[PDB]
Design a protein around this ligand. Structure first.
Ligand SMILES: NC(=O)c1ccc[n+]([C@@H]2O[C@H](COP(=O)([O-])OP(=O)(O)OC[C@H]3O[C@@H](n4cnc5c(N)ncnc54)[C@H](OP(=O)(O)O)[C@@H]3O)[C@@H](O)[C@H]2O)c1
Ligand SMILES: CCc1nc(N)nc(N)c1OCCCOc1ccccc1CCC(N)=O
Length: 168
């Protein structure tokens, strides 16, 4: 199907996770998956994106701010320099755009989850176990519903699938 009705406010979370729920370590995403970059890009294009400061830090710098999207960086550092983005000091202000995609990281997903009505999740079939210091994906309960895509191979051979969850 791929349809998801929307209301006067849409707050979406988008992430890619290992089976174990690892999304981040050492300030990076511990795999590369071209189809997921393409998916992340097309979903978020033209929208406001919200990210924690550490996620802004983890962006390759030549791709800061992410092109074609309104970049919003959540930080408690009032003097934080984020060239080409805006810095907001609270989650409330961050989610004021009528359509917002939260693009990371572990901290901000957790805080934003209660307001979210879509989760766009790439499951990467990689057996990375949770380690000390890892950033972790939220656990979705059964208020979330939607569609699970088929397993696909990237040309590299890495296997992945897409979940598109929503709720009222
Ligand atoms: N696989 C994926 O889909 C994916 C996507 C995005 C990121 N990641 C990874 O996840 C990791 C980063 O995640 P993380 O959980 O460490 O950090 P994060 O959520 O990106 O950023 C946390 C920072 O956000 C700010 N913050 C958090 N809550 C706030 C609030 N209520 N008000 C104001 N500011 C707030 C603070 O910034 P200040 O310290 O500046 O105050 C905090 O240190 C990296 O490894 C990144 O590569 C993975
Ligand atoms: C594509 C990764 C990703 N994937 C999903 N599915 N949700 C996310 N929030 C998500 O994270 C978006 C923030 C980090 O983006 C990276 C990180 C490493 C390499 C590439 C990118 C894409 C953007 C760019 N031009 O660099």
């Amino acid at each position: 199907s791929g349809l998801v009705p929307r209301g006067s406010h849409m707050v979406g979370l988008i992430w890619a996770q290992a089976t174990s729920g690892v999304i981040g370590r050492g300030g990076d995403i511990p795999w590369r998956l071209p189809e997921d970059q393409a998916h992340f890009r097309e979903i978020t294009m033209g929208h406001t994106i919200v990210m924690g400061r550490r996620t802004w830090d983890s962006l390759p710098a030549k791709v800061r701010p992410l092109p074609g999207r309104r970049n919003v960086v959540l930080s408690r550092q009032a003097d934080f320099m984020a060239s080409g983005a805006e810095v907001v000091g609270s989650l409330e202000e961050a989610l004021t755009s009528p359509e917002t995609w939260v693009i990371g990281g572990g901290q901000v997903y957790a805080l934003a989850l209660p307001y979210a009505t879509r989760c766009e999740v790439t499951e990467v079939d990689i057996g990375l176990p949770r380690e000390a210091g890892d950033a972790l994906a939220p656990v979705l309960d059964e208020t979330w519903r939607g569609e699970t895509g088929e397993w696909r191979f990237s040309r590299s051979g890495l296997r992945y699938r897409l979940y598109s969850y929503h709720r009222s």
